[PDB]
Design an enzyme around this catalytic site. Sequence first.
Site, PDB file in Angstrom:
ATOM      1  N   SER A   1     -92.691 -41.498 -17.841  1.00  0.00           N
ATOM      2  CA  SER A   1     -93.614 -41.384 -16.824  1.00  0.00           C
ATOM      3  C   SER A   1     -93.373 -40.040 -15.928  1.00  0.00           C
ATOM      4  O   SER A   1     -94.231 -39.383 -15.504  1.00  0.00           O
ATOM      5  CB  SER A   1     -93.587 -42.709 -15.805  1.00  0.00           C
ATOM      6  OG  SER A   1     -92.373 -42.431 -14.774  1.00  0.00           O
TER       7      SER A   1
ATOM      8  N   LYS B   1     -87.674 -46.450  -7.026  1.00  0.00           N
ATOM      9  CA  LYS B   1     -87.693 -47.868  -6.534  1.00  0.00           C
ATOM     10  C   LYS B   1     -86.630 -48.035  -5.543  1.00  0.00           C
ATOM     11  O   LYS B   1     -86.835 -49.018  -4.790  1.00  0.00           O
ATOM     12  CB  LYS B   1     -87.890 -48.789  -7.511  1.00  0.00           C
ATOM     13  CG  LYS B   1     -89.113 -48.701  -8.410  1.00  0.00           C
ATOM     14  CD  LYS B   1     -90.570 -48.646  -7.522  1.00  0.00           C
ATOM     15  CE  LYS B   1     -91.678 -48.990  -8.704  1.00  0.00           C
ATOM     16  NZ  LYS B   1     -91.707 -48.121  -9.771  1.00  0.00           N
TER      17      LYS B   1
END
Lengths: 303, 303, 8, 8
Positions: free
Chosen positions: A272, A42
Amino acid sequence: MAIYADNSYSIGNTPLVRLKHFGHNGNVVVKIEGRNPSYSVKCRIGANMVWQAEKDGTLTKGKEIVDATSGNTGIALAYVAAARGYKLTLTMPETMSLERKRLLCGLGVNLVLTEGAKGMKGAIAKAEEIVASDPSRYVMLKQFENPANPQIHRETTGPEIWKDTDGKVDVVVAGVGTGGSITGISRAIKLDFGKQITSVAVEPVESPVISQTLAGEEVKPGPHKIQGIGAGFIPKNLDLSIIDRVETVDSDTALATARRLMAEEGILAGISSGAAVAAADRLAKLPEFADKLIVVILPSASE
Amino acid sequence: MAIYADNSYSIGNTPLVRLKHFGHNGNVVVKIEGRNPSYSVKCRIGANMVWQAEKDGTLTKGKEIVDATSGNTGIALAYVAAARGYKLTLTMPETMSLERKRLLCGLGVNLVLTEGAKGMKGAIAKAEEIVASDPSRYVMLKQFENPANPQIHRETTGPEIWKDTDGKVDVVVAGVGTGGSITGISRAIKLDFGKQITSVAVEPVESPVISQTLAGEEVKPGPHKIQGIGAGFIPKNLDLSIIDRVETVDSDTALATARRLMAEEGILAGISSGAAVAAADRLAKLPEFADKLIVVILPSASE
Amino acid sequence: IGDGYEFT
Amino acid sequence: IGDGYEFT
């Protein structure tokens, strides 16, 4: 001379590592996005979303940033807001981690906590109210729909993968949260470089909304533990048209896969990353993929 | 083709970032070692210590690793042991962090905890006992005295700094724990490249043993909060002869400086990064250093 | 490095 | 991203 003018400019050039205990004869390679400021993928979008809003003049000296993320995007915006001299308010549902809380306060974020029960709906709601009260003051960047999210991946993450594999990447596997990673990467290799790879999105079995959508079945979201993916709807930043395949993975297997990367490869990856590797492992062990170089995004570090 | 055969090979090529709120007109640049596997500068020595022990044949298939670190070196060895298929035992004084504990167990480390009161002395003791019981089995790498520690810094960290500054680095400031960082870096730029820079070691005011030593005063160690530095003795891996200057910094100022890097630069640095920056700031604000490019090592990320 | 000898 | 809508 290679000196960055602020932390925001240091994003990317993350490394490719071959896995030893997954795939078949080293056909699975991982790209570690934990090797970034704020320690997640991110960092790329936090920087480009601010940079684009600057270039187009929606963000100036005087204007504050507001947004609703309860994940790595908060941390990403926090570091960038700090690096470039912007005030930041983040909304999120109070049943958040003191650790996450503390870290964000440390980075100089204004925290507005919303009712536990009401979740992200609550936090999103309250964010829009806050913009609504002074439109000329606050700007919302909206990670789910802002095209500066996938664009950075097309300009950096995709090219890195192409360069580091001397054009040999055959497959890219990526969990989907906002969809920005798989979208930008795919556009870059397919359209910019001209190679027809297999683009593989990954989602929790608990909330398999991309799978249900493409199969023209009833979309049925649910709770899961795979932080970073499984939004429970299709984001605008997911370009379905570039997705060749969709693999679902369960919470328990994603966690275990994470613990395996730690114990067996010495790779400190988040849950993840575990989900992404489980999916990649599965394809890497089909004869159709045996001689194919498969690249997997590891979005974050531990936790 | 740029694909690492295991995580160990991915060390380094960490970035240079200019500071905006320290120094004078951007004369202080930081090298972020948090951008590494295991998220600290110790990733370099964990890898080279194992690699050298392999090359010289002290470490083979069959042999286990034992050592006593209660800091980032444990984490570094853990990831490398995992990446290369070695069993690892670490000793440390039980009044360690569950978080540190948990992380090390996750990485597949055998943990032998020693009495709180007895501290590192306890843990070192118990480590040597464990080697003593089966010398042909266990190998101790000994970060304080192993020349593969400074050597890696001479081969990587130093050259990176030289390359990224186009030979313009004038000063290097580094906290000292084992001394490996400042030693290797200094040898590289002074001896390998031929430029007479100013090498600056940093230590807690609470435990200023390098300062007392060089001044021929009584060595008086003490407790402090600047995790990573202030061993309370001179390590063999600190080459005093390349140290041009020594700066002391207090716990409170090191912490505050850390919090400032977070809030003002969007740089997620540990307490010892805070100490390193406080020292650098001070020199950067002397007219003698005003026109000098100063490079500071940031050893770790937050906490 | 946590303690070489002493950290708190 | 923690919740888009739902994570635990």
